[PDB]
Copies of this chain bind each other. A is one copy, B any other.
Amino acid sequence: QVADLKAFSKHIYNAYLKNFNMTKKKARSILTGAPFVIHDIETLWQAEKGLVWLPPYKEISVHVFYRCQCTTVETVRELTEFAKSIPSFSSLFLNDQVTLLKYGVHEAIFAMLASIVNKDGLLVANGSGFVTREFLRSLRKPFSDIIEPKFEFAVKFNALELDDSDLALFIAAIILCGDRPGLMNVPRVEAIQDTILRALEFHLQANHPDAQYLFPKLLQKMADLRQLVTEHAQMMQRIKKTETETSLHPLLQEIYKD
């Protein structure tokens, strides 16, 4: 079957290249040399006034929080199209497709954020802006609480030096997850995941021949991402409890609803 794994992997890579606005390849060329640097209120206003780029304005920390929601909505759209282009995802009934996306998108999002991140900050607005990690840390709690763990995960994840062909299989494995709550056809999803994981293992052997233990390291990263999302959801719950004037986008209300 191993020669069908290579074609399986290539189909997933093509779904990735077709559907995601930013690749790690493009992002890393931007980050190595230019993006307008957002590092304080004045540069953020500059960036919004046209140099780089929503519910009614509230304050700076809430505004950034709203922009975080907008990127999640847009990435969910891309992840949905990516998943629909995956072998046998769209053969599942639509409710199973929604269940897999509901519980998988944030795990995928936080892994993909690593592609547009270095230790100093984050690419925004199609790579035309760069918002500094220090500026994001300087925001008001509880909003700054959600930021730093994602940088901490991303820097360690980027040390693995994956490329876009690796990430396409990695993201596919995150989505096709058999133990999501309320899944209808568990055996079918488990079977698809096993095929992706076998394809991923085969791909890493060819693409990273000298890398030690890369496949089990990635399996651990998938476990770390589930914990990262658990902690993130807890922080989102505190924001919902304590920041009642701050809006939550309807799509995110449905994702975080129990």
A contacts, CB < 8 Å to B: 76-77, 80, 93-95, 97-98, 101-102, 184-185, 250-251, 254
Contact = CB atoms under 8 A, between A and B. Distances in A.
Nearest to A182: B254
A186 to B, nearest CB: 10
A190 to B, nearest CB: 15
Contact of A98 (B94, B185, B251): B94
Nearest to A84: B94
Contact of A97 (B76, B94, B102, B185): B94
A250 B189 CA distance: 15
A95 B95 CA distance: 8
Contacts of A94: 80, 94, 97-98, 101
A95 B93 contact: no
Contacts of A95: 98, 102, 251, 254
Nearest to A100: B94
A243 to B, nearest CB: 22
Q: Identify the interface centre among A94, A97, A98: most chain B CB within 10 Å of its CB.
A: A94
19 contacts: A76-B93, A77-B93, A80-B93, A80-B94, A93-B251, A94-B94, A94-B97, A94-B98, A94-B101, A95-B98, A95-B102, A95-B251, A95-B254, A97-B98, A98-B98, A184-B250, A184-B251, A184-B254, A185-B250
A95 B257 CA distance: 13
Contacts of A251: 93, 95, 184
Pick from A80, A95, A254 the residue with the most CB of B within 10 Å.
A95
Closest 7 CB pairs of A and B: A94-B98, A95-B98, A184-B250, A98-B98, A80-B94, A95-B254, A93-B251
A97 B102 CA distance: 14
Given A97-B98, A184-B254, 13 more contacts: A77-B93, A80-B93, A80-B94, A94-B94, A94-B97, A94-B101, A95-B98, A95-B102, A95-B251, A95-B254, A98-B98, A184-B250, A185-B250
